Amino acid sequence: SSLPEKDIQYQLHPYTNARLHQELGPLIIERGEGIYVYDDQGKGYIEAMAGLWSAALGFSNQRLIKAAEQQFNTLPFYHLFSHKSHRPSIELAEKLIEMAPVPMSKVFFTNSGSEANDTVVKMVWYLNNALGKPAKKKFISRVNGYHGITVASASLTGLPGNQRGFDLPLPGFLHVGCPHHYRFALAGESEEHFADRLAVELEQKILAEGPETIAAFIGEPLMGAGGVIVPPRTYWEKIQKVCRKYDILVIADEVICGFGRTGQMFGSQTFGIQPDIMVLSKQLSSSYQPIAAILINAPVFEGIADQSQALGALGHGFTGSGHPVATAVALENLKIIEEESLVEHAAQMGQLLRSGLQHFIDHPLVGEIRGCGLIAAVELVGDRVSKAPYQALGTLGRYMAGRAQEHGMITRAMGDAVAFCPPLIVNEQEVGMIVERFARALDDTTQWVGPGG
Amino acid sequence: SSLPEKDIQYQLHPYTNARLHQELGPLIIERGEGIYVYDDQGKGYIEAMAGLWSAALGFSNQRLIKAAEQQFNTLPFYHLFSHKSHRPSIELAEKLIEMAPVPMSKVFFTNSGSEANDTVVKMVWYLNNALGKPAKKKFISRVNGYHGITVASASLTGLPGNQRGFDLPLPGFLHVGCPHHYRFALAGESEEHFADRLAVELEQKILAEGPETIAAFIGEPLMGAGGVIVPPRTYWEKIQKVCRKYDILVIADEVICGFGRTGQMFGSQTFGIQPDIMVLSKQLSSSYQPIAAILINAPVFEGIADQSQALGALGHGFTGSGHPVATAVALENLKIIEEESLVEHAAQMGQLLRSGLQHFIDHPLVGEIRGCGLIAAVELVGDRVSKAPYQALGTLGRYMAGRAQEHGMITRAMGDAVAFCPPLIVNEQEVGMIVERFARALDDTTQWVGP
Numbered sequence: 001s002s003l004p005e006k007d008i009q010y011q012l013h014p015y016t017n018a019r020l021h022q023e024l025g026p027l028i029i030e031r032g033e034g035i036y037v038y039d040d041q042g043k044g045y046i047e048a049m050a051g052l053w054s055a056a057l058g059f060s061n062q063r064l065i066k067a068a069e070q071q072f073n074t075l076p077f078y079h080l081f082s083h084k085s086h087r088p089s090i091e092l093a094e095k096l097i098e099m100a101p102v103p104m105s106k107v108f109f110t111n112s113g114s115e116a117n118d119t120v121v122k123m124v125w126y127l128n129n130a131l132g133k134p135a136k137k138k139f140i141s142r143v144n145g146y147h148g149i150t151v152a153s154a155s156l157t158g159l160p161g162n163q164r165g166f167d168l169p170l171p172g173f174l175h176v177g178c179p180h181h182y183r184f185a186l187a188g189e190s191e192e193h194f195a196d197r198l199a200v201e202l203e204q205k206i207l208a209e210g211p212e213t214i215a216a217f218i219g220e221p222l223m224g225a226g227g228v229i230v231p232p233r234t235y236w237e238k239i240q241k242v243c244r245k246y247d248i249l250v251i252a253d254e255v256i257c258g259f260g261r262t263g264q265m266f267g268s269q270t271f272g273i274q275p276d277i278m279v280l281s282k283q284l285s286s287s288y289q290p291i292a293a294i295l296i297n298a299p300v301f302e303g304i305a306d307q308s309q310a311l312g313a314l315g316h317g318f319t320g321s322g323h324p325v326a327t328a329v330a331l332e333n334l335k336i337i338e339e340e341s342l343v344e345h346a347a348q349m350g351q352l353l354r355s356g357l358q359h360f361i362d363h364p365l366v367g368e369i370r371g372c373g374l375i376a377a378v379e380l381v382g383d384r385v386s387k388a389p390y391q392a393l394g395t396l397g398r399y400m401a402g403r404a405q406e407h408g409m410i411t412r413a414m415g416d417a418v419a420f421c422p423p424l425i426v427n428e429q430e431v432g433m434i435v436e437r438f439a440r441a442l443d444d445t446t447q448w449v450g451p452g453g
Numbered sequence: 454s455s456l457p458e459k460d461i462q463y464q465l466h467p468y469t470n471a472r473l474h475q476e477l478g479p480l481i482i483e484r485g486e487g488i489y490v491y492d493d494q495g496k497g498y499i500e501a502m503a504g505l506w507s508a509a510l511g512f513s514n515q516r517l518i519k520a521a522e523q524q525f526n527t528l529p530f531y532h533l534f535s536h537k538s539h540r541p542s543i544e545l546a547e548k549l550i551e552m553a554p555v556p557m558s559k560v561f562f563t564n565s566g567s568e569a570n571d572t573v574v575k576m577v578w579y580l581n582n583a584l585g586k587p588a589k590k591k592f593i594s595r596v597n598g599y600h601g602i603t604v605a606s607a608s609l610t611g612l613p614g615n616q617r618g619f620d621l622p623l624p625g626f627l628h629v630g631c632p633h634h635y636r637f638a639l640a641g642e643s644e645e646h647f648a649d650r651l652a653v654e655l656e657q658k659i660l661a662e663g664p665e666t667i668a669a670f671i672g673e674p675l676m677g678a679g680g681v682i683v684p685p686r687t688y689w690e691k692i693q694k695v696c697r698k699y700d701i702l703v704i705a706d707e708v709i710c711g712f713g714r715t716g717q718m719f720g721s722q723t724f725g726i727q728p729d730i731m732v733l734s735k736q737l738s739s740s741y742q743p744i745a746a747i748l749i750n751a752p753v754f755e756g757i758a759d760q761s762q763a764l765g766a767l768g769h770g771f772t773g774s775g776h777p778v779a780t781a782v783a784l785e786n787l788k789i790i791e792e793e794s795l796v797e798h799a800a801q802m803g804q805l806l807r808s809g810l811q812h813f814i815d816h817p818l819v820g821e822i823r824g825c826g827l828i829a830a831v832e833l834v835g836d837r838v839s840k841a842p843y844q845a846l847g848t849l850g851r852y853m854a855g856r857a858q859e860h861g862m863i864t865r866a867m868g869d870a871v872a873f874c875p876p877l878i879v880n881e882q883e884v885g886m887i888v889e890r891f892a893r894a895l896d897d898t899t900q901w902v903g904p
């Protein structure tokens with residue numbers, strides 16, 4: 001019984017067509033080193049996604065591995081319930097609060113981004129009950145946002161693939177437009193006027209729903225899984241004025257943007273967001289351990305704290321909340337990002353990545369090249385004027401990604417956009433290789449389609 | 454500035470009164486070894502809870518620590534999305550399926566129990582939509598059950614502490630009786646007749662709701678966080694006959710019971726449960742890594758698989774699903790439990806624990822002593838005839854737990870019950886020490902309550 005046969009036999013894979021998987025089986029990844037991973041045939045791939053937008057320090061950072069060992073050999077597991085605590089969680093929470101781009105009060109730890117956002121939802125409901133506003137419960141998020149996949153966080157999420165078949169979203173989870181100019185702007189509309197229209201949409205939703213019923217607005221500073229969607233100029237400024245106008249919390253989902261991905265330490269800095277709550281994960285630990293953190297500002301903490309007293313204790317927490325190994329690894333991870341000036345380095349590598357891709361700006365199949373910092377995407381189209389896909393939506397993206405993999409590079413297609421989110425430690429010449437392999441995949445795709453013109 | 458001051462300054466603690474925490478600060482745990490943990494003053498405590506019902510191999514197992522190192526140095530992170538895979542997840546899934554107490558088809562991994570049960574809820578909804586039964590969505594769980602704390606898993610949960618202030622439960626999450634004879638039986642009613650009445654309650658709920666609307670029944674074989682509640686004789690047999698009668702899935706939440714806690718490898722074995730779905734965590738990895746697993750049987754998998762094809766892909770998964778380090782650690786963990794025959798050893802230590810606690814059966818504040826295997830609780834009361842609490846429910850439990858800690862033992866109070874769920878590696882004399890420290894806490898509690 002071979003290893004692929006066992007995988008087919010025993011594992012139900014996430015984000016995978018189960019029947020198709022029974023036919024093709026897995027691609028088994030055996031080992032990692034630097035920005036590379038190698039399959040069970042010995043073939044090497046540049047992991048241009050950093051796994052899942054996450055492996056900031058790459059796939060063989062010994063300092064993270066040692067930090068884990070040291071913590072294992074001290075205290076391999078403990079918890080934070082009932083006043084219990086431990087050093088790694090305490091020092092990580094300290095670090096996170098002091099590096100926060102706006103004044104923050106407290107950290108709450110979870111294992112995952114989905115748990116974190118699920119927890120934010122509950123916290124907001126608990127908060128507003130504590131403040132005597134029991135109607136103020138609804139969340140507003142965006143079409144194509146991704147915020148995880150619990151019953152509640154999938155309701156925040158605005159990708160239909162996370163909702164069809166699942167009876168989601170739940171009631172009370174509202175959606176407004178995807179701020180993607182290329183796709184949803186009217187013909188000859190400015191970024192700024194698009195932003196205006198989106199802010200008016202949101203004010204209109206709030207009034208139709210009754211402002212007293214709206215608790216919070218949540219958004220990724222720029223949307224990751226939904227297509228590396230950079231919001232238009234002035235979006236965040238104008239969306240926030242609306243939120244403050246009706247006393248609505250602003251939650252920044254920084255699970256992908258956090259820790260140097262967008263050219264600065266947080267997407268909230270890059271895009272001028274003053275969030276009341278931040279959600280962090282992925283680069284927090286370069287995914288070497290599962291860990292997420294929620295940062296809450298003073299007003300949010302004080303209301304929650306009052307209620308936890310009235311009710312005896314805060315009735316919430318995961319067994320793994322603040323896990324000493326995961327928190328110890330994250331702490332070292334963050335120190336490395338500081339000590340090696342990887343935010344600034346990522347910004348530079350991001351400029352290289354983008355320039356390299358921009359040699360293809362006038363290619364007949366390239367509709368848009370977008371990104372900032374060290375996150376980017378190239379959205380392919382069948383026709384540039386109409387912006388229509390070749391064959392069905394997704395066809396080009398799937399073909400590109402398959403070619404890229406053939407050429408030793410792992411990228412994820414989101415419809416017809418192919419994404420780049422490489423490790424922060426990527427060096428100049430590695431950026432070159434990434435772009436080369438993108439180009440070879442585009443070439444193959446171009447021969448396959450035969451654009452002519 | 455000092456480490457407690459930082460914790461107070463920067464951390465919001467789960468299951469903690471936040472204001473009281475701003476006053477007292479934390480109890481900082483610095484290191485662990487065997488069944489013990491030590492605070493930052495050097496004081497040692499027997500961890501009679503095994504942390505959170507979870508640290509099966511204790512707090513310094515080098516084999517788990519090595520397995521982690523070896524995996525870290527091979528592949529420290531990867532994922533299972535889009536047909537990607539890796540050895541540890543594959544070999545763990547294999548092991549879990551082959552050791553399952555009933556035929557199972559597939560494993561799906563999450564980080565936590567709460568995520569797991571949340572995922573089970575979605576899977577059941579996805580399944581029944583696939584089968585063209587869009588009305589069949591409601592879950593039935595029990596009062597005082599605990600199944601985690603996401604918006605959906607907290608709705609499954611039946612402890613009001615997890616719901617007050619959170620606008621839970623959601624609609625479609627139904628609750629039937631806690632199967633706790635001591636509290637809910639009528640006078641002089643047998644365990645068997647109590648079980649009959651509970652099965653009738655469930656059939657009646659199903660009919661009142663419309664059977665076509667009921668997707669699933671979920672239960673911990675015995676309830677952990679709700680008070681170490683052992684169901685009465687014949688409960689599970691009779692509850693299952695009702696569920697099969699209306700084609701209702703039976704989900705066993707084995708997050709605590711799993712891997713030797715109840716005298717056998719699974720609570721499903723100990724209590725005669727034939728679940729369609731099982732949820733595992735905690736002792737899965739001795740909590741050295743965050744990991745949970747869902748085991749689904751063939752019919753559940755086949756329906757989901759069909760739908761994931763129709764819809765392009767199964768639109769669900771956590772970044773950490775099947776994390777190579779966490780799965781590698783769990784795999785080694787399970788091997789150790791087998792190689793060291795810890796299920797059988799835990800059973801023996803459980804007999805010692807329970808007989809040691811029984812010396813207090815006639816104490817004026819002891820209302821009930823319960824448990825099986827290596828899980829147990831002593832429920833204190835202010836008055837044995839009336840079963841009423843001293844002052845208010847929880848007052849005794851909070852005092853006991855504080856005294857136990859003073860006497861070098863960490864136990865958790867669930868209301869006025871104090872629990873025992875020590876590491877499986879606990880030895881005979883350590884069981885004695887646990888019982889002795891319980892006894893010293895009870896003495897203190899007894900003098901405190903006074904005349």
Ligand SMILES: Cc1ncc(COP(=O)(O)O)c(CNCCCCCC(=O)O)c1O
Nearest residue numbers: 318319505565566567599600601678708709
């Ligand atoms: C039976 C059961 N099922 C699910 C979960 C959730 O696990 P997670 O914490 O999400 O990984 C649990 C968890 N147990 C911890 C006990 C907390 C209850 C409060 C208390 O101990 O008083 C369990 O047990």
Ligand SMILES: *Cc1c(COP(=O)(O)O)cnc(C)c1O
Nearest residue numbers: 112113114146147148255771772
């Ligand atoms: C991947 C992701 C999540 C969910 O994280 P998990 O740990 O996979 O639950 C949440 N938010 C964003 C923006 C993400 O990209």
